[PDB]
Structure 1
Amino acid sequence: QYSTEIPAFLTSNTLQELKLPKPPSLPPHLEKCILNSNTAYKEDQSVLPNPNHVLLNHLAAANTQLGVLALSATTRYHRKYVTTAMFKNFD
């Protein structure tokens, strides 16, 4: 069931307040991003290890010092994996 409007209670506002639940803690598998792996320039620097089929399609991000956005996701193409890394402006 979708919706277009900001839930009201998140403007009460807002300390006071319910003393609402925490989100769950970070599970161990999002601790590591395969992009940080370049075992491979020996000699094909594009090779990554096999991903982990839980983490297909999760956005990852990275600091550039260049004033653009670094984004990436991993996906199955037929039986092979493509991690695409996008460099993109903000405007």
Structure 2
Amino acid sequence: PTVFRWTGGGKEVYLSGSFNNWSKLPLTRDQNNFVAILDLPEGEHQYKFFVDGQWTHDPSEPIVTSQLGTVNNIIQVKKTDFEVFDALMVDSQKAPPILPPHLLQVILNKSCDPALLPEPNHVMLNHLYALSIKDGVMVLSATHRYKKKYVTTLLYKPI
């Protein structure tokens, strides 16, 4: 289906085109929006408007001038125009922030298993945390998720 919309005023607005043997199909008014939606065989179609006793084209829309001086609008209905994700894809063509308190909520500091840990907030995953370099060795740490499970890795690395 293709949307044909006239944006202006008028008492009676019609849509004439190749796809209807140039018969005056009427457009229904909402506000300053006159519409009729209809399916067109994906290809080339020429149309024109009969806005209140005057034959016009939509100047904003693409035109075609004839060997006979006929000035009509043109519509190249594409296959990509009908598939939503295809259409959307074709269409897509200071001071520092304050530290969110969330990044201070850890799981290592906060009877039971020392290997086990509390579940983390998505927001603090993949962030690097580290213990002070004590005795020329660095302790680095980060919580990451593999599938529906989490792993907090500590690296004892000298420097």
Settle same-fold status: TM greater than 0.5: yes
Larger radius of gyration: 2
Task: Look up the match of 1:47.
Answer: 116
Matches within 5 A, 1:7-86: 21-37=94-110, 42-86=111-155
Q: CA deviation at 1:22?
A: 2.4
Number of residue equivalences: 66
Contiguous gaps of at least 5 residues in structure 2:
1-93
* Partners of 2:101 and 2:112 in 1: CA distance: 31
Stretches of 4+ aligned residues off by more than 2 angstroms? none
Which structure dedicates a bigger proportion of its chain to strand? 2
Q: CA deviation at 1:64?
A: 4.2
Contiguous gaps of at least 5 residues in structure 1:
1-20
Task: Look up the match of 1:89.
Answer: 158
Q: CA deviation at 1:80?
A: 1.1
Higher relative contact order (CA 8 A, sep 6+): 1
SS in 1 for 2:108: helix
SS in 1 for 2:97: coil
SS in 2 for 1:73: strand
SS in 2 for 1:54: helix
Indicate conservation of the 8 Å contact 2:128/2:141, yes or no.
Answer: yes
* Partners of 1:33 and 1:63 in 2: CA distance: 16
* Partners of 1:55 and 1:27 in 2: CA distance: 10
Q: CA deviation at 1:66?
A: 2.2
Alignment TM-score, normalising by the size of structure 2: 0.39
RMSD of aligned alpha carbons? 1.4
Aligned residue identity for 2:103: L
Q: CA deviation at 1:23?
A: 0.7
